[PDB]
Design a protein around this ligand. Structure first.
Ligand SMILES: Nc1nc2c(ncn2[C@@H]2O[C@H](COP(=O)(O)OP(=O)(O)OP(=O)(O)O)[C@@H](O)[C@H]2O)c(=O)[nH]1
Ligand SMILES: Nc1nc2c(ncn2[C@@H]2O[C@H](COP(=O)(O)OP(=O)(O)OP(=O)(O)O)[C@@H](O)[C@H]2O)c(=O)[nH]1
Ligand SMILES: Nc1nc2c(ncn2[C@@H]2O[C@H](COP(=O)(O)OP(=O)(O)O)[C@@H](O)[C@H]2O)c(=O)[nH]1
Ligand SMILES: Nc1nc2c(ncn2[C@@H]2O[C@H](COP(=O)(O)OP(=O)(O)O)[C@@H](O)[C@H]2O)c(=O)[nH]1
Ligand SMILES: [Mg+2]
Ligand SMILES: [Mg+2]
Lengths: 430, 49, 49, 431, 47, 430, 434
């Protein structure tokens, strides 16, 4: 009940969903043929949140996959658990955006998005009582970074009260794969800040320090990345799907996290992460877990959180625990690190408890932190974007189909204003 | 009091291979090795009329 | 309480033992791949001369 | 649904097309007869309905010799017999002949064949064009075909793999003239141009492959390998795919600047190939080192603008990223100030294939590089100097005048080259 | 060529010597000892 | 509770710890895989002093192994009981210092100390009620002598109230292996005197002499020296882990042994030591224990205590013995050698008893003596230092990375001042 | 993860590099073809690189302008061992002309050599340093050595470079022009090498005659001895030891001032199999033989001057107590005296891997050995005699035109002789007491 529809676009988002659906199917005990084979009765009480029921006793995900090139869709269909997806929900173009934000937002998007809007409207009206929408996409690619944002605007214009969640992958300068990343990144953030209720930033480089340092595995892969990110996204809504000591849903997090409407950009983290070779030495305890998600290393973002101060924090625990040492550690860490915590909002940590752990683990935690450190990504993006724009390099591609440099100037000014307004509260005093 | 950079210095096992054979890279492509086959093979004759 | 505490040992030991074989087999198979590949250049040498 | 059409003109174009078509068929498992003994060939071929396959290529030439040798070669049954346009009279290195007298009667038939090919086509990504520039036929027919295609199709992408005269090695004595004329023609009509002068390839095959006696066939084999590494991503699945449309959004800062130089690695004979690990760091360092550039140019005299690299095999993205970090740490390679990161990277799973009886050895990891750098001005400068030397006394000009094009056209080509040099100089300075 | 030939030549010794270097070589006294508290022997249950 | 954390740096300290941990593990009945197999219940109540409990029912030592050359601990891992040590506690560089105090204290060490400080903060911060820290290091080597004292100072600012003990191996000119030992020894002791609460001096010459004369064994080895220092270390903190007639911990020792705050350089001795050929003839009695206590040759320092006067003495006895002959023999020894005891501190011997002896010996002794005899070590090392320094020999290595001769002059002046102040009390009369 | 790169230039350098590469492959058990036979790791990574499957590639470069020796190597029994194109050869030899090897033809080979150096150094991560081998009495050797040292000093900076140079004997000589290029080369390397060792031939001849009982020695035996010295020095890097010593731990202990970095070595025991088993070869006896002046690897008498430092590497099953006891006796002896400001002057290293024997060689199985490297004030005598010989020649300006006509300017000899005088004054002022 209080269910959420899943929608994804772009290659990165499609790969993300390909593992998110697989992991959630494992959690609920669903085989690749869509027939239930679980053991606990709790696994089927709340199956309606993500699954619709069809004749013959099978389930289908309520996912909408959108893309501009059918190659990725054809590759993901043949993969494991690729048969769960309804063939109708697939929507794809025949040309592609070519990493051009103007192309993926203006010239063909208006023509293509009517069908996907119709199908998502059908899905939204079908469900009992809609809770919100969640989207996964990357800001470095044209088709994703444009289509996702335009769809966000359209969906918000239709459902002003429903909740909005986005998993946005941002391009860091250390691992850069396409030269035109700053342009569409700035253009996308301009639109995204205007409508998204929650955005969580994800960086490959942060993922990558995590995978080399904690797991200590020799050969990382995109599959391992998708696994980490999927576990992180499953943890946020596990408590919505399963009983717990202290239930807390997306609206709870929304009210408890954002002091002001425009500060809705977070970084997330998952725990515990250990190398398989050291799995036996480590002891799973609440203090160890809390130091573990509060480590700057495990953070999913390139920002260094000790360069600023936390606006607020939230932790979701999975497994059978008592609230005692949990709240005790929260108070303890807030006392110990008072310098990194802003003072005019006392007791700025949220705790949520869910009694069921993930399969294969006894304890798990997902941490969401709103801290002042996010400004550094936008700063570096601003420097790169202005270094590009001052020489007017790579501009005629964007200008050739209706977009003009006035929009780029407005996007840069708005993002810089966001940075300034965001750092304003960092040094604010009571 | 540790940051993301400057923390990868610590040695763990032999996976430093992927990250540190180019620490002191001994410059690079600064040297000219165009048409240096002059030594391997034998040079063609060059005669006056 | 002490019983599940003593019970966890063998799960952990068997898990790490299994992971060691996974480590070893990957190296073993890559050795064989490089071996057959190098031996293929032996036929290439014969073809060339 | 993904396909691309190849155009070959001139003897050099035909002898490179033949080489690339042996490699294409051997890579896709198609026999010389065209009969196969799920759908990856649809990029380059088309199913006949039952049995064999036909290439999506067209061959043009005005001298019947090379078309005749193709039609009497082992590949008689492969090509569509009416798609091999053969002429009667060569233009004989005369650009004017091929651009004003005999090209007019060619162009209508050629466009008819291209239209017939395109009607079968449904998801046309673009065209590849192959033409030697030091020949009158190649230059003139290339000018005419690009001129007509630009208006007939418009926004469709076209890639030109031209073989420029070497700085000091050349076969003819009139090639600077038609070379400059072709540059003026293609500057405002070709989306992407790749430099392929012969001298650098001679140096490469001398140093690395260790053959003291190669000919044009080896050069064509190398060019075919480069094209295959370029277009693998359109027909093979990879962890990170690239399309031909993803070049004019990554390699051309301004519409005027679209000339790039290529490189390939590793190039090594079988006598010393696997006796070293040939790992990613070594191959990508050999790629950026100045010797393995397919063009006779030194990048050290200029800045880099944009580098696009495609890897094929079992390469690991972490390998390539570790190499890129070290390269950016490197000092001798310096990029332009208005581009902090200028690397585009693509990865494919399918390893390169080997042509039987060839020279190259097979390896798991291969890299093919397209680089746009400010150093390309020197070849234009030397060609301009050579052109001015012979135009100072109006040498050979009467042959071109007596074909029907006016006297003045050389002046506009000279001014356009001057403008190109000034534009490169201006983009090369830091703000 | 006269002097320089391929010849046939063919770690346990190294390991043995390394552990010998860390070895005790003099041990300690012989053990008659059994653990017992000081204040436990004096204070006992009485009938 | 009131537990302590072990930290060692340099290969010499690593070798010392490799035997200290084996002897303590044998004392507490812990197998090399860390599973308890003890016989009596007395072996488990106070195991929290040096070990942490982990999942799988095993114990991990709380030691931090830090260095700049990987080979030494890559070797210690292959040794017996090398599996107890947690992998994450290994921190080391790739370059090393090459016996250079300046390099180990300014250039590489300043950068590297971040992680080791983080992990030390980890372990000291996780302990319930911290008692103090102990370090083991040699002062003849540049890296050890520099980075050890740097971290000593850094820990000192953050934990001023906790107890600090250092086990310092100082160069003896009779058996020297390096030509740059005086420089780094002086530069290091300069900071050590200002920060270390306790410093026990150990002398390789004296250990070789002890092995030659007392044990009468033909070929002493590094293992022998390590065992001597290990037994000496164990005897100090035995009473902290085992009950006894008179409990006596590190704070009580510090209160009763140091008259003035700058006088914290002690010499320690162990008893009984005899050739295993002579084991049968030995009569284990308290008078024999005391006579082997106060023997000049039993001391592991080359300084002759009969060249000066004892300031304070302290004795720790292990085994079941009665206080009668303990105090009586102590008083008799004090009266018999009155001239060697400075007069204005009557009753200048502390005694402590613990009834649990070391494995193998029925009764055992640890002795700590504060006397004026240590001045000769500083005098001779200062003579070597000035012989080196008057000619500016071996100097530009230290000056090539920021240190000037002003620090050298200050260090030698401070050493001479401390020597003068130390011998001032030798002739003091009331 | 520790590596070191070896350079061989000149005919003597090549003939000693091949000698040491036989011994190193012999020690690591690698067959001459390079393939691992039959079927403890990372003991070859110090000098070798794995190809991914099978054989190993040495980390050495061979340079020559006269390609006879290189052709012999490429047709020899080690044809499959070396990389086919790191054995770099020219076309015309320098013909004992330093100007030829420093200004005329070496400039066209140095670029390719440095490219090869890059292609080898990029494959290493913990590069400990460089070893260079070259005879000083040869034109191409001295010239290319000077050029490489100059280029590497500016291209790399702070890396350590060790020169195993072979000075001409005081009275036994092969050529007549070698003093000139010797003085020029020592001038070049004084401000460019961190450590240089003496390897003159007459001392090795005398050692072979006295102990090995070889009345007719040749270059092969000398090269084997030098290779054994190299192996003794470098065993600490690739074998575990109680007191390990690294390459970087030399310039911090053995060179009291930057200008003084010339040292001379000895090895013990030197003995034949038919008499080796006749005696116990105790540590005290071998360490006395090491300080025996007649066993100096360079014919320089230590009794004529003071010592600054001595670094001694023992290999076998020696014990640190025994080493310390022997050092005590050496200190007690009066015929050897140290400089006043150096009370303690010994650096000691110990390693367990016993020296390997080359079958068909001269050495035998001995379970203990020690190699010493000493810096002492006595080395100034060879410089004095070399300066006198150079002055005798430059009095009449003989042979000068052969260097002048190659582009090397006339005044070059002047500052070379001046720097030799300055070094002699430096040694004189160091040798005095305070
Ligand atoms: N790399 C390469 N270059 C070629 C080849 N064939 C011709 N060329 C070059 O082309 C230049 C002259 O043009 P060609 O291709 O030979 O002749 P064409 O293009 O047919 O023009 P016409 O001679 O007038 O018929 C020569 O200078 C060659 O350098 C080839 O097979 N490979
Ligand atoms: N110890 C030793 N010295 C050698 C050997 N071969 C040559 N030399 C010395 O090298 C000096 C001359 O240089 P060479 O090695 O013969 O040849 P080079 O160094 O390449 O110089 P060029 O002869 O000009 O080519 C002579 O004075 C010899 O003393 C050798 O095998 N062993
Ligand atoms: N974590 C993760 N990142 C990916 C994956 N695939 C691509 N990326 C990243 O996405 C970026 C390119 O995005 P792109 O494919 O152009 O997005 P699109 O245009 O919307 O399809 C690259 O920098 C990759 O690092 C994936 O499977 N997982
Ligand atoms: N007791 C003992 N002393 C050792 C051991 N290893 C080294 N030493 C001492 O350490 C001193 C040398 O220290 P050094 O190597 O310079 O320390 P570093 O700077 O950390 O490398 C020598 O005088 C030895 O007496 C050992 O295993 N046991
Ligand atoms: Mg032609
Ligand atoms: Mg020679």
């Amino acid at each position: 009940m209080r269910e959420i529809v899943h929608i994804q676009g772009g290659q990165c988002g499609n790969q993300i969903g390909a593992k998110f659906w697989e992991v959630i199917s494992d959690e609920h005990g669903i085989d690749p043929t869509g027939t239930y084979h679980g053991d606990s009765d709790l696994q089927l009480e709340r199956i309606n949140v993500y699954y619709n029921e069809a004749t013959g006793g099978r389930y289908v995900p309520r996912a909408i996959l959108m893309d501009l090139e059918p190659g990725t869709m054809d590759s993901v269909r043949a993969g494991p658990f690729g048969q769960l997806f309804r063939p109708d929900n697939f929507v794809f173009g025949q040309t592609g955006a070519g990493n051009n934000w103007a192309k993926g937002h203006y010239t063909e998007g208006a023509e293509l998005i009517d069908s996907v809007l119709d199908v998502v409207r059908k899905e939204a009206e079908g469900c009992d009582c809609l809770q919100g929408f969640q989207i996964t996409h990357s800001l470095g690619g044209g088709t994703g970074s444009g289509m996702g944002t335009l769809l966000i605007s359209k969906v918000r214009e239709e459902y002003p009260d429903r909740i909005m969640e986005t998993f946005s992958v941002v391009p860091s300068p250390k691992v850069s794969d396409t030269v035109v990343e700053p342009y569409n990144a700035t253009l996308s953030v301009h639109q995204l800040v205007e409508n998204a209720d929650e955005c969580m930033v994800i960086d490959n480089e942060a993922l990558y320090d995590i995978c080399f340092r904690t797991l200590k595995l020799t050969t990382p892969t995109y599959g391992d990345l998708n696994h980490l990110v999927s576990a992180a996204m499953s943890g946020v809504t596990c408590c919505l799907r399963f009983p717990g000591q202290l239930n807390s849903d997306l609206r709870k997090l929304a009210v408890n996290l954002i002091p002001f409407p425009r500060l809705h950009f977070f970084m997330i983290g998952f725990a515990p992460l250990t190398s398989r070779g050291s799995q036996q030495y480590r002891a799973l305890t609440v203090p160890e877990l809390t130091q573990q998600m509060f480590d700057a290393k495990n953070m999913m973002c390139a920002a260094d959180p000790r360069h600023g101060r936390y606006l607020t924090a939230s932790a979701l625990f999975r497994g059978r625990m008592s609230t005692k040492e949990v709240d005790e550690q929260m108070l303890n860490v807030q006392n110990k690190n008072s310098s990194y915590f802003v003072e005019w909002i006392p007791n700025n940590i949220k705790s949520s408890i869910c009694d069921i752990p993930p399969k294969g683990l006894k304890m798990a935690v997902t941490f969401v932190g709103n801290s002042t450190a996010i400004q550094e990504m936008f700063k570096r993006v601003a420097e790169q974007f202005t270094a590009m724009f001052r020489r007017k390099a790579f501009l005629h591609w964007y200008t050739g189909e209706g977009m003009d440099e006035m929009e780029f100037t407005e996007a840069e000014s708005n993002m810089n204003d966001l940075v300034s307004e965001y750092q304003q509260y960092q040094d604010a005093t009571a | 009091t540790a940051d993301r950079n400057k923390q990868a210095k610590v040695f763990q096992n032999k996976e430093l291979a992927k990250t540190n054979f180019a620490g002191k890279s001994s410059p690079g492509p600064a040297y000219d090795v165009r048409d240096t086959d002059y030594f391997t093979y034998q040079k063609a004759p060059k005669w006056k009329i | 309480e002490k019983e599940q505490k003593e019970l966890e040992k063998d799960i952990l030991t068997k898990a790490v033992a299994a992971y060691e074989q996974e480590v070893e087999r990957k190296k073993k198979e890559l050795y064989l791949t490089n071996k057959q590949h190098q031996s293929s250049l032996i036929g290439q040498m014969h073809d060339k001369d | 649904m993904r396909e691309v059409i190849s155009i070959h003109v001139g003897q050099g174009g035909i002898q490179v097309g033949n080489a690339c078509w042996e490699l294409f068929c051997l890579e896709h498992g198609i026999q010389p007869d065209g009969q196969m003994p799920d759908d990856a060939f649809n990029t380059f071929f088309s199913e006949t309905g039952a049995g064999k396959h036909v290439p999506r290529a067209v061959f043009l030439d005005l001298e019947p010799t090379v078309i005749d040798e193709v039609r009497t070669g082992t590949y008689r049954q492969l090509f569509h017999p009416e798609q091999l346009i053969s002429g009667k009279e060569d233009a004989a290195n005369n650009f004017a002949r091929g651009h004003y007298t005999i090209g007019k009667e060619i162009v209508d038939l050629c466009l008819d064949r291209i239209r017939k090919l395109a009607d079968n086509c449904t998801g046309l990504q673009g065209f590849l064009v192959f033409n030697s520039v030091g020949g009158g036929t190649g230059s003139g027919l290339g000018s005419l075909l690009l001129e007509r295609l630009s208006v007939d199709y418009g926004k469709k992408s076209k890639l030109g793999f031209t073989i420029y005269p070497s700085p000091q090695v050349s076969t003819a004595v009139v090639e600077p003239y038609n070379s400059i004329l072709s540059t003026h023609s293609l500057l405002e009509h070709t989306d992407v141009a790749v430099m392929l002068d012969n001298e650098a390839i001679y140096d490469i095959c001398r140093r690395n492959l260790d053959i003291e006696r190669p000919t044009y066939t080896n050069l064509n084999r190398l060019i075919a390998q480069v094209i295959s590494s370029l277009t693998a991503s359109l027909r093979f699945d990879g962890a990170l795919n690239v399309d031909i449309t993803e070049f004019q959004t990554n390699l051309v800062p301004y519409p005027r600047i679209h000339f790039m130089l290529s490189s390939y690695a590793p190039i090594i004979s079988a006598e010393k190939a696997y006796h070293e690990q040939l790992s990613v760091a070594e191959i990508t360092n050999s790629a950026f080192e100045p010797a393995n550039m397919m063009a006779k140019c030194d990048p050290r005299h200029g800045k880099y603008m944009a580098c696009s690299m495609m890897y094929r095999g079992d390469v690991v993205p972490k390998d390539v990223n570790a190499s890129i970090a070290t390269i950016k740490t490197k000092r001798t390679i310096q990029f332009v100030d208005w581009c902090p990161t200028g690397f585009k990277v693509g990865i494919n799973y399918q390893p390169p294939t080997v042509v039987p009886g060839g020279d190259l050895a097979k390896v798991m990891r291969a890299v093919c590089m397209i680089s746009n750098s400010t150093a390309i001005a020197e070849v234009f400068s030397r060609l301009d100097h050579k052109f001015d030397l012979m135009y100072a006394k109006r040498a050979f000009v009467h042959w071109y005048v007596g074909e029907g094009m006016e006297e003045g056209e050389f002046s506009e080509a000279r001014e356009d080259l001057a403008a190109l040099e000034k534009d490169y100089e201006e983009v090369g300075i830091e703000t | 060529a006269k002097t320089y030939q391929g010849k046939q030549m063919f770690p346990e010794k190294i390991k043995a010597l390394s552990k010998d270097l860390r070895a005790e070589h003099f041990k300690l006294g012989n053990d008659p000892q059994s653990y017992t508290s000081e204040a436990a022997a004096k204070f006992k249950e009485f009938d």
